[PDB]
Amino acid sequence: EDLRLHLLLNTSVTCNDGSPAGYYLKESRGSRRWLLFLEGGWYCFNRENCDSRYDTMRRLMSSRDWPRTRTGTGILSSQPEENPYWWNANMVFIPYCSSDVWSGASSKSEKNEYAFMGALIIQEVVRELLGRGLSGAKVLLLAGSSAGGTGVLLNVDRVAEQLEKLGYPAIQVRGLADSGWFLDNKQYRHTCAPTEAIRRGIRYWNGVVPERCRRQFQEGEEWNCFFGYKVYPTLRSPVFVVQWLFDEAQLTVDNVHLPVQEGLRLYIQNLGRELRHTLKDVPASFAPACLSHEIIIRSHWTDVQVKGTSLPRALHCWDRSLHTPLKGCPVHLVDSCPWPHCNPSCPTG
């Protein structure tokens, strides 16, 4: 139970229900690497579905019942056996309690039953960490899984700009977006689809998107910036993208529920090809042909390989690339085989 809870000293930066947001921290003295991980866990986009989430997913909306410690797992583990990549880093787990894909900047008030402060939670965690050693960092890796991976894409440049404005231009801000790279495609069977939900959420949350992406799609169309293949080209920070080709959350929002017949076989194969296409020009990426969801904080995240390279190895190669491609140390790893578990190293379930 190595990461210790700190509730935000600025108690106006809150979870959905107005309780203080926070972060779990395990410091590594003398490491200048900082890993800030954004938890995932879907979202809610109106009073009714947020009220339901408050009843049976309350830890995702409130800090009142958070434990005082959490154990770092996967990329948040401090044991080299479990985390070959960054076991010696300063470790931060930021609980997802804003239900807004880390995009919101609205307080709970007279007019708002819930606060949606995800974007501000990230800025406040960064601000308070500077006094706990982040000021001496050389790399800040903003990582995240599922809604947290989309949160990385939405916030990594804002963290870089925040540190630049606060007078810390030496800190290299980077992003690692795990299972947050979704397609606004056709559902397999046509209730709120992966487009309308984000459209409603933005209004309900007062959600904010990266500025260059906002300037392309403009008012009313900022929902576009929640989609990795649209927002990624606008980003300036280096971002490593981890995405299963047949992501279970993607299939869920596509109304696919797994003897597969022709129509569904073609649908699933087309989905993998489309995902693979959107990553063709993403130089740092890890995209195995598996039916799964999330990876980087799983204890067995070291097991999966693409073309014989594990994700911890790919991330280490990425680190080296950010010191021409490296001999035997690849960073672009996208499966080409066209069906779930055509990669033998896929998670077993």
Q: Closest residue (Cβ) to ligand NAG? A: 10
Of 5-13, 38-46, 164-172, 273-281, the segment contacting ligand NAG by CB under 6 A is 5-13
Indicate if 52 belongs to the active site: no
Residue 13 touches ligand NAG, criterion: CB under 6 A: yes
Residues between 318 and 337 with contacts to ligand RIX, criterion CB under 6 A:
none
C-alpha separations of 13 from 127, 214, 249 in Å: 12, 24, 29
Tokens of 246: 């047949």
61, 141, 147, 159: which one binds ligand RIX (CB under 6 A): 147
Of 291, 83, 312, 278, nearest to 181 by C-alpha is 278
Residue 175 touches ligand RIX, criterion: CB under 6 A: no
Indicate if 293 belongs to the active site: yes
Q: Which of 62, 146, 237, 310 is catalytic?
A: 146
Q: Using CB distances below 5 to 8 A depending on partner kind, what does residue 120 bind out of ligand RIX, ligand NAG, none? A: ligand NAG
d(CA 291, CA 246): 5
C-alpha separations of 203 from 76, 90, 112, 185, 209 in Å: 33, 35, 12, 22, 12
Of 212, 213, 211, 191, nearest to 200 by C-alpha is 191
Q: Using CB distances below 5 to 8 A depending on partner kind, what does residue 66 bind out of ligand RIX, ligand NAG, none? A: none
Indicate if 146 belongs to the active site: yes
CA neighbours closer than 13 Å in the CB half-sphere of residue 258: 16
Q: Which of 63, 100, 293, 310 is catalytic?
A: 293
d(CA 181, CA 209): 15
Q: Yes or no: say if 63 and 7 are a contact pair by the CB < 8 Å rule.
A: yes
**One character per residue 101-130, x = contact with ligand RIX (rule: CB under 6 A):** x-----------------------------
Residues in touch with ligand NAG (CB under 6 A): 10, 12-13, 120
Residues serving a catalytic function are: 146, 247, 293
